[model samples]
Target: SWQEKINAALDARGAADALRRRYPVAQGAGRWLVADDRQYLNFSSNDYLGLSHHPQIIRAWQQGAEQFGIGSGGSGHVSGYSVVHQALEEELAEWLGYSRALLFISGFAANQAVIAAMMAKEDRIAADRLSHASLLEAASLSPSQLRRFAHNDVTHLARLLASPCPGQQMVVTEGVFSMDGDSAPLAEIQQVTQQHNGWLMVDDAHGTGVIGEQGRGSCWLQKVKPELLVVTFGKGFGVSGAAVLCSSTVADYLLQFARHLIYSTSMPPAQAQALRASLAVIRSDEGDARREKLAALITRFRAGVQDLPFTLADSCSAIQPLIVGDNSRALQLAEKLRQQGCWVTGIRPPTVPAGIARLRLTLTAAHEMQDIDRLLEVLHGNG
Candidate 1:
């Protein structure tokens, strides 16, 4: 029966295709990617600050590997919690203005661990409809009563909070939406949570290290520190792993009870060291300049595509989505762009709703003004 289901999925035209194609990349992690013996101007990376290949970060990771070795062979609760881990947690907590912090293998694990540990069957959860897949999965699998409000609709969320619920309530949202690139109205969302005596949680995966003063993320930018903040290193941090920033008591509870963190092997020490290096850069003038450059690129892109055939979302963030409305059309457009040496990816159903398939172009500080212009020319010509 399982085989039959698998075959059926494969035969279905719109079903998921895991091995649709293969791409072999041979070089740097910046704006240019070498794949299939060809060079492409990439517009599909999350390295907003372009720090993945920074000389300082590379040296720090190398030195850390020399000091701590290559693998963390055990789980955090066992023997994997090293001094570097402790230092990273402390630095993250202080930098983000939280009382304490706990590390997870990834942003997904952090969200799932926190939700599973905090929400019992008697509790309730209010989440944004457009929250990340990890958040949605965690909420759905949790034993709590889950209610999703319309995307970024604070008034609707307030109504959801107005109803009586059992046990504790957790209101969850993202700082910057992943696909749409628009920011959540965190201040208004925080106000609603506070009014209902509920805790607010933010997954600032895309906002940290890119937005806000000192790169504190969208909550700090909006002047609201949530009860719990999930910050990931893959995006703006230009590394891997994630951290959950909360009060000391909450951190202790997760340390004791979060199964994902407790059972999983901790992140490598070298990665932690590299993340520390990333933090140092994030707090420097260079980080500010990178942010400014990225902002300018976004402005230039938005201005360039003003009268394009496809409609662009109202997003000023690094992510710019051009909605093509049809799945096939989106894929075709992406292929056309790739043929022209601009490697922009097409986002289709499941990742986004059907009939709104789009091309998700992510700009980075490493990309020059000419690259953006060239991509625009290809896009305009293809459209």
Candidate 2:
């Protein structure tokens, strides 16, 4: 029976020590999280700039809800779209120097929709091996022939592109990789793609609102704009939703063919209003201050861990992962930190490759020197 097969697979995964679980979390704001009524300093958050609970952002959401209601009320193609949504899209496009920007509920949906709409059987895609699951999963399911180059390897990308597949050539990668916290050499990769007459697609999910001047994003930082750029709000923006930056025609094409956008309800008008407020903060001097603080945190955390038990990854970003080879060992280390009142999560296969399980610690503007020191002490077995 199908049920028997399902349990067998589940049992197999459990026996392999690879089963996934979810924790009921509360009070996940600033630098703290509460689980089972116990509070822990949160080092597992992706809210890199600490804008999630900004007073202005919250007020804007309230005001927007008062004016525009709590929901869009229908799919975008129906009656859900609002002036606030249009204004936000226009603002984002102008800020990013793109001809247009289209919104989606999440980065996953946006990536999936774009790949599905643009790539036919006649298209070919070369993606970075370590791209977000949102991108790789979408590519795998697309009609386009898909191949992944070694992570951040432009030469490998060039080699993959050299093979003439019967289709339009496109390359996709993340601006800042999620797990390892390393950035891609986007300019060189774009150069290689252009040399082969291929289009470049970058998902700057971890780069927007954190990198470049005024947080314009990774493309702005590297001065290499891709054919399609996806920026999600759940990270540095301290909000929710995602946007794809592209040409005017591409925007129209997506609206027509992207089922994710057309079929799903538009994001709540209030949320869009808050995002506009968040964007305003992200481009302001306040945002600069937060970025500097975040950089300082990253630097301090990296400096403190040089002689630690685990291998620290090469990263200048807000994420600092300490690699511990065995998955069970990684789990134990995370548990140890939790017992000491810090909340860092252990990442294991197949989220990451086997033999590279890690404690994925994230730093934010909300984190202080004491927080960094405390976590370091905990890791050093002296907390």
Candidate 3:
């Protein structure tokens, strides 16, 4: 019976495989995507501030590799702790204004660890409908009662809290929605959380190193710090890994109890050092100039495309989703862009709700206005 149920679930998930077949993944770079001897100007990655390939970062990463090695080789709780890892956490905590930060090999693991460790059957986890897959999936795995409100609807969230079940509540939301490219009203949510005396966790995976001063992220931009902040080094930092920022108490709790973090192999010390290097660049003058160029490119692209069939979406940062609503058309548009050599991906149902399917375009400061101009040229030519 269980096997039959599993087969049924896999069948329902058939579209995922079909979609991947239509748009196969490839080993590629961010600013310039290469495929079959053709290179397309990329506008579909989260490397917003573009420090991934910075020379200083590269040097630091190389130095750490020479100093340590390619892998940490053990779980953090066991023996992965090292001076470079410790230094990276210290730098990240200082930059993000958190008392402490914990590193995980990936954002998904960090989410699972944070949610599972903190909440249980006696606690309720209330999330925005559009929260990340990690948050939604992790919520179900824990003993906590899981509830959701409409995307970004504070009133709906308030009502859920008002009717809540368990002893305490934990509210979770994305700082900048990955698919929609809209920001959560953190200040309002913070006030609500405070009123209810609930713990709030903001996942700023997409926002960090792209918005606030020195690209500190949406939390800083909104000036509403929460109990826990889950940030990924892969996006704006142009590296792969995640961090959970929190107050010392929350940090200590997660470090002691988050099974995923406790059980999984830690990020390489070299990678941690690379992140520190990326952070340094993020705080430098070159980063400021890159951000300015990005602002100009965004303005140019928006003005050029306003007359198209698809309407401009709401976003103050780099993640922009051009809504198409229908799944087939959204998929077709993505195919068209790829045929023209762009690597933009169409986001569909299950990831986002049905009928909200669209192109998830993630622009970066690493690109020039000329790149945006080329993209606009292709888009207008196709339309």
Candidate 4:
């Protein structure tokens, strides 16, 4: 039994109304969330570097809001382009080692704009099965005929490439799979795509602020320059908007033809200023300490849960998943953790494949060593 069974059960029984009674949503910050007015160790937040509360980062946002006002007042193609926006775009381009960088209001828009505009109707796009929903949906709407390879399976991707029939071909994937917290084999994929005369694009959302040295994302760590790299400011940069890094020609073409880029109101000027400050902090040696501390916390957590009843995915990133096959058991475990004063959340069907419900623990550098130890203590005690 899987999605159908779960849906049937939920349909029969109606929604479970006890969620509000148990968990407190968001209160202060950092590894502990408020629940029933009591603070619990938070292992579910996406604030990887714990930069959400840093004075420098907060100040950047505050100053940006003050200087640029709250909104752009119009789209980028209109009268919305500002000095702050241009400065951030330039800084982002230089930092990303790209000839040009264009800002979008979101990762969804950036991915949608690039794929839908770049590929013609006769083109084909082979995407990784586990790519983010935005990429999947964008591909669905793009002009190209879309296909999916096996999750993280480079060999299947090679086969798809070999059998392609197209005027143009593009391969798409995330630099790191979001839910699973594992990296793609970029070197092999890059080589295979090149051998097959195809272009490659990567959405390095999760990898940006959480992985690689200086947090350039997984593509930067690969040292293999993708034809297009889309990185968002929301996750790693701890800000809003997105950036597309590519050649000058591609940039110019997109500016001319991409409807999402040209028609929409641009991201706010304040977001750009905030992005610049975020980039400065990210590029400097300051993030190194946070990364190391996070690594240590991961090590401790894994070591503590070595004897758990389920299989844990192997990953070096902040996203660690404890796989529990049955949704009911997953819910039970999640409730147990919550009762024990931890905020790790359980992810069920539709988000992931049926029967693969899991506890997706997103660790952050803000968490103290004791926080990890306490989570471990809870899991061990329950088991």
- Top model number, lDDT: 2
Candidate 1 C-alpha lDDT tens digits along 35-140: 8789999888898889888888999999999999978989988899989999999999999999999998899999999999999998889999989999988999
Give the per-residue lDDT digits (tens) of candidate 2, residues 1-383: 99999999999989867788888898775688899999999999999999998899999999998999887899889899898999999999999999999999999999999999999998888999988888889999998999999988989999999998788988999888989989999899999999999999999988899989999888999999899999999989888999999999999999999999999999999999999999999999998999999999988888888878667788899988877765484486889889999998888777887687788889999889999999988888884
The regions of model 2 sitting more than 4 angstroms off are 327-330
lDDT of 1: 0.88
lDDT scores of the candidates, listed in order: 0.88, 0.90, 0.82, 0.81
In Å, residue 134's CA in model 1 sits off its true spot by: 0.4
Mark the 10 consecutive residues where model 2 has the least summed lDDT: 323-332
What candidate 1 gets wrong by more than 4 Å, as runs, is 12-22, 327-330
Write model 4 residue lDDT over 76-117, tens digit each, in one string. Answer: 778888878888888878877899988999988899889888
Error of 3 at 343 (Å): 2.4
| Ranked candidates (lDDT, high to low) | 2, 1, 3, 4
Q: Candidate 2 vs candidate 4: which has greater TM-score?
A: 2
TM-score ranking, high to low: 2, 1, 3, 4
Query: Candidate 3: global Cα-lDDT?
Result: 0.82
What is the total number of backbone clashes in candidate 2?
0
Could you tell me which 10 consecutive residues in candidate 3 have the lowest summed lDDT? 18-27
RMSD of 1: 1.9
